[PDB]
Design a protein around this ligand. Structure first.
Ligand SMILES: *[C@@H]1O[C@H](CO)[C@@H](O[C@@H]2O[C@H](CO)[C@@H](O)[C@H](O)[C@H]2NC(C)=O)[C@H](O)[C@H]1NC(C)=O
Ligand SMILES: CN1CCC[C@H]1c1cccnc1
Lengths: 400, 400, 400, 400, 400
């Protein structure tokens, strides 16, 4: 319209985008800054980078861009692109994007009295410390620091407004505990003037159903399956195969776990402790199985069972576990030959009895170690899992 | 020509590209918006991003860009590049691209009476919720929300038109169901003026032939092979090794499947339930194999067969399964020797009888568990596979 | 020089880069379009994207860029950069690049009579359907569709010229069959004016030496090795281990091939059919091995061999394979004791004979299944490989 | 300063950056072109690209940018940024980057006498054919082609200078042999105008210590370990597991090497034929092991051993291999039973004496195949490794 | 404000952003350069690049941009954007980014006396040589080389200020040691003028808790478990299975380690030496196991034990290891038929004695090799781990 054209022509006369729009030069310009979170796109733990979608909110007052609406009956607000108006240089300090600024430059909407709004959208990638000590039951706090780059405290007065989460779209993996903000003032080695900034601390909680049913339960099941090696009879020579293949499955699971975790040396993660405990238990079970097989195949005349071992294994541990241990001239020549055969059979019977005793001792050791290893596995698993904080509330929120 | 040159020179006289091309400033400007889909290029479930190829269609009326064809006989339409004509700032709200605007700026074609058309092509990436509860028999609805950033409802009148899919190129993995659209207007915390927007909901269905052939058939066949352990004689030791190798194969298949799936905790996927059921069945098979092996290698004099075990296995189940039950002084001194030899043979005889009885019990247990596990696996796989909605439709559309 | 400076000053006088350089505003402007292929950079089958290196070739005639060479001695050609003279807005419709234009804007060479040439180099990513039905003996036709975006048939008359391949650099994996071109005009839902375009079809063939030697032959030897299970004697307990290990290796190969191929449900790939056949054969071999082991370890007193089973296995198949089937009062007490031992030995001998007969039947079944499986796998592999079209051409070209 | 301010004001007066700075328009402009390499950042064989760090060097003479130093004391050189003075359009033809140009436009430094110098830096990404025939002992020649895009020899005649490698930073994998340059002069069919271009050939030699220590040596060790199947006694049923597990390790190594290799079908690479030979050797070892196991477990009465098998294995191969051949009325009825028992024992001993011959034949075949396979693997490995032309150079430079 | 509006109008009057802002053109302009480090974002060992977050700091003095604060009250500083005032062209030579300059162009702040400050932020990708010989216990020195591109001695002399690390954010992987810098002069053959540059050497120490808990310890544990083959009785067919399964775990773990190393042939890394040592240890263990099994299953009448072998393995080593050495006519017919049985039993007994001697010799060999390998592996591991510098500091810092 003619009035719009006239206003647009009159508004830009003698205007200078480099100038701060203040009536008095020695007074700071107040700028209100706020943030609107729409979605959390990614939390990369290996690279420790948070990718979110946010709209910035910058509102201030322009002294020159004012007019009387009576003289311009139709128009009420105007709009200016980048480069034709003065804008604050609000930047994210801890950005991780290759381009340090990742905001789409939209229009600035101007009031009939000079008020200016600026709502640029953006996919922001920032670097925040990520703690994996209590993984997967962890809670993360990532900071977002915004501030003016070249305007101090005596030039641009930054004020904070509470963040907006009405448009938030819930994420599948991460809950949103919340985003509080605070305004701080700092001194930099460059200069001798305070530089205010606004920091929003996004606090999220990880939902644990996926990891719990994909990574924890299989490990428990395989660890419990590794205990069947103590139930197999020694004659069926397939004990080392069982133990070593369970160990192989466990170590490939360990590699799968480690491929998604950053190589930080602050502390030992909970799942790392879990996998170490499972590794140790399976290795000890393999060692015990080797000892049991050594007992089972003992050479009957190789040696004698020591008295202490005989007592401990035969009369005490069997009592504990309620196990019962099993069990005419020509005539003389024929006589001595059949006597020789009978003596040979008697010696064979004694050797068999000794072998049976050794086999029973092996079975007793096997059962005792089965009981001990089951108790160890249960106690270690329960302790490691319940050591983490907020585990109860994570379980209650996710699995129930 | 001279007419074209003069018309271009005249049409830009006192033209401000910063004003809405309207005759009456109070009245809004109507802009017709539409979309033209060309190809659905990618659907990333892990990152939950939809990548498509679309042409936007914007149509409006410019009041200043009008002329008489009689004065310029040759010229009928003109073309204005980016930055020299007023264009709506319509963009995608939910964009998952590093640059928030992924459209290609092209010329605007202008009528002889002020009708401007704008057809910018683009490769658009958006973030939409991906539901994997019914993988692979799932249907996805992804929303594209377009709107003007800085023009409210009192200055811009966004009117929806119907999407065009006449040039759509079918995809080899996703079968397009449709793409309806709807207009809405919302209130934002920024301001006190309604803002309209247009949302197009792409509804698509996944073709399941590839997944059904490459992922479900191998698992079914491998689980069926896992049931061969109950048909394997216990004399040859190959049962534990076979079962554990099948377990390893299931583990690698599970990791391969989980490599491509989102780590969400909204619900337990159907494929995850299927894999868990198969894992449990194979683990129970290994446990039963251990029990049968322990029964078969039972030492003869190490105990007596319980009456309950006898009455459960040796008679009842054998009847039900129709398995037949398999069954001068020297003239003195030589006599006790031959009696000793005969008695030793007799003792060996009834020991062998007891061992044969135990082996028959083991065979009975093997047959029982074979039947039970076959029934269980068939029921479980059929129920899990058929529990998903629109599964018969997917089968009848892909396989037949 | 002075003449060059004068000419450059005169040419840009009153020149508008927005108008079509035509003497008459009604007649269309003829533009000659051509392509120069340099290399086939990539063919992503999984994403279905063709990346090529090409020089476009646009030629037209400009009415305003003319001068008399006599008045400007020495200068015979001028050059104008991007944004100072009119250029066609020719784009690639099938672009899969994040930016719809992947051309490098070079200079425009202008004649002494107004003939303008424009050869912008570029690396182009386009979307074409990659058929994988006959992997790896397949031929691909990928389309590159170029056209003007905002100029209709009444303004820009597009013309086609034969593509140039004189600078083609041969690719190590693809053989260029050819690159024909066609010109068509289509009607779009936007407007009521035809829009001409030029489509170039790149037809190329895949060389099948790498795949044949790395992926098909090793599977053939693995399948052949799987047949050795029908030669191991049953006493050596390794048949199940061999079969299951071969099956695991085949599954690993299956995952390796599956991770490069698209997830399309359009058709069943030939390689998928071939691997499915190999896996089915191996599984059937494992089942047959289980049956043979069950026959071999038969209880001597379990059950008599059926008459039909005897008359078949021990006679018909036995003759077919030309294998022959193997084959004083104390004196009374002494006699009665010796007779019992003799009778026990006789019973043992008869049981041994029965066991030997069962083992011979198992061997017969083993050899019969060996012959059957070898024939079946040979014919299946030959048929699947030979079913592909141009298989003979591919093998001849890539091997001989 | 005022002097350089006045100089800058005077120089750009009536200056056209589109004009070729030559005093005489008929004469062409001499441009000296050179390259300075700093680093071979990457050599990708799968994608066949070369990434290097390069400073270009362009030198020419300007006719209008000249001044007298006496009139402007203290000013000897000036500097002009991109887009304000004429610059050559030299480009790299065989580029492999999404943007065709990969240079960083720096300033142009200018003489007091008009000689212009220009040194843009860049991370250049070109495409060259990477031969892989003699991998790892391969030498690569990659060509960089530079030329003007729209200037001929009667407008701009390119010259040469030797490439500078004084600042080259040695790479840890590739050894630089040289960077020779060739100046090509192409003629068209229309015109006698030369067209000069400059091509630089980077010659690189791969340092093979890493590959020879991580791929060749472990494969040799595992293949040698695979030869122990001919040393294991057949009684311990573990002759098949060794071979199958070694074959699985070989397949894993083949997958590892195939992950990094291009899919070109130009020739069979050295590492590929090496792994094929090892595959064949292992498979033949498994077949021989099956034959030996068949010999060992022969039935005692399943058929007389062939005369040829006797006369060869038991005599000739035994002589060669220096292995020796290992090795009242009731009283009559009592007599009959004792004779029966003795005859049974005689028959058992005679039958047992037959199996010893089969076991000895198995041992003979085992040792003979051991020596044969040792010779085979040694010959194949030595020949395949020494077939490369650079083997001696590589082993004398890297390992020594 | 009117004062700053007038000041901004006055400052840019006759200002040329091309000339060097110095009062006397014969004197160099002093520029102070430094940087502030914020974070070490990534250290890529495979690609040999270093990603850091850095704020440059360049300060100088401008002769023209000066004013008296009395005439413009309330205005103390001004801000100019890129392209409106002169700035140094300081770049980083070691850049590894696609765009050579990765800095972000912010405003330049000018005081009342003409002092100019410029602090652009950036994420810089440098290319520094990474020495991986002592990995994990590694210390890295990475150089950043900053300098002007087209300014020399009497044009611009660069001066150093100390780097600032007061804002450094600790990394969980690398422990920063220091960032010492150096100002260096390069002299040309042209003329006596220094060319200054500034080099900053970042020294980082890797924190080795993650690697020591994920690579070294599990390798030690599995290698120790590989020694259990020397405790398994030979009667259980699992020695080869144990050894080769441990070998498989070792080789897959080696492949994982090689996935993260760079393919540099300058030196052999510590972890590679350790893995090779474990390879040889396990292979020799397998060979010894084969020899022991060969001794165990020796034919009783296939050859007497050599005298040397007897004296070595039955007296000397047995006393060393303290192993006990393990454990009417018819009557004539009866006599003859009984003597046969008696003599056969005696022959069986003596053959059993020979077999027992062979088995005891095998056990002695097994124990000897157990002790030898147990010493060897400990010695090799301790030596390899302790052969690295700063190992004691690394453990005492990371672990304790
Ligand atoms: C404008 O800013 C500069 C910042 O360097 C001031 O220069 C410093 O001023 C302090 C105060 O006397 C001195 O201690 C420093 O030695 C100065 N630095 C240098 C390199 O000279 C400068 O004084 C300020 N000018 C005005 C009018 O405020
Ligand atoms: C044929 N052109 C290219 C695609 C749409 C169509 C068009 C028509 C009018 C204005 N812009 C584009």
């Amino acid at each position: 319209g003619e009035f719009q054209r006239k206003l647009y022509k009159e508004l830009v006369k003698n205007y200078n985008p480099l100038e701060r729009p203040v009536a008095n030069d020695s007074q700071p310009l107040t700028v209100y800054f706020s943030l609107s979170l729409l979605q959390i796109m990614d939390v990369d733990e290996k690279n420790q980078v948070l990718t979110t979608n946010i709209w910035l909110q910058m509102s201030w007052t322009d002294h020159y861009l004012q007019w009387n609406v009576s003289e311009y009956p139709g128009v009420k607000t105007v709009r200016f692109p980048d480069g034709q108006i003065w804008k604050p240089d609000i930047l994210l300090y801890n950005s991780a994007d290759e381009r340090f600024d990742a905001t789409f430059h939209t229009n600035v909407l101007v009031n009939s009295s000079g008020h200016c709004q600026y709502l640029p959208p953006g996919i922001f990638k920032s670097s925040c410390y990520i703690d994996v000590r209590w993984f997967p039951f962890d809670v993360q706090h990532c900071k977002l620091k915004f501030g003016s780059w070249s305007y101090g405290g005596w030039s641009l007065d930054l004020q904070m407004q509470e963040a907006d989460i009405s448009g938030y779209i819930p994420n599948g993996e991460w809950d949103l505990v919340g985003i509080p903000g605070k305004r701080s003032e700092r001194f930099y080695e460059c200069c001798k003037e305070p530089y205010p900034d606004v920091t929003f601390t996004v606090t999220m909680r990880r939902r644990t159903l996926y990891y719990g049913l994909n990574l924890l339960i299989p490990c428990v099941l395989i660890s419990a399956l590794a205990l069947l090696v103590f139930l197999l009879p020694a004659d069926s020579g397939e004990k080392i195969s069982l133990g070593i293949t369970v160990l192989l499955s466990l170590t490939v699971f360990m590699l799968l776990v480690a491929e998604i975790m950053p190589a930080t040396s602050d502390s030992v993660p909970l799942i790392a402790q879990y996998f170490a405990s499972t590794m140790i238990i399976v290795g000890l079970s393999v060692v015990v199985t080797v000892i049991v097989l050594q007992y089972h195949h003992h050479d009957p005349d190789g040696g004698k069972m020591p008295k202490w071992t005989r007592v401990i294994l035969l009369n005490w541990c069997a009592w504990f576990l309620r196990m019962k241990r099993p069990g005419d001239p020509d005539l003389a020549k024929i006589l001595e030959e059949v006597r020789y055969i009978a003596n040979r059979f008697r010696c064979q019977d004694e050797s068999e009895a000794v072998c049976s005793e050794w086999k029973f001792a092996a079975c007793v050791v096997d059962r005792l170690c089965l009981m001990a290893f089951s108790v160890f596995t249960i106690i270690c698993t329960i302790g490691i899992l319940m050591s983490a904080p907020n585990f109860v509330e994570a379980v209650s929120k996710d699995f129930a």
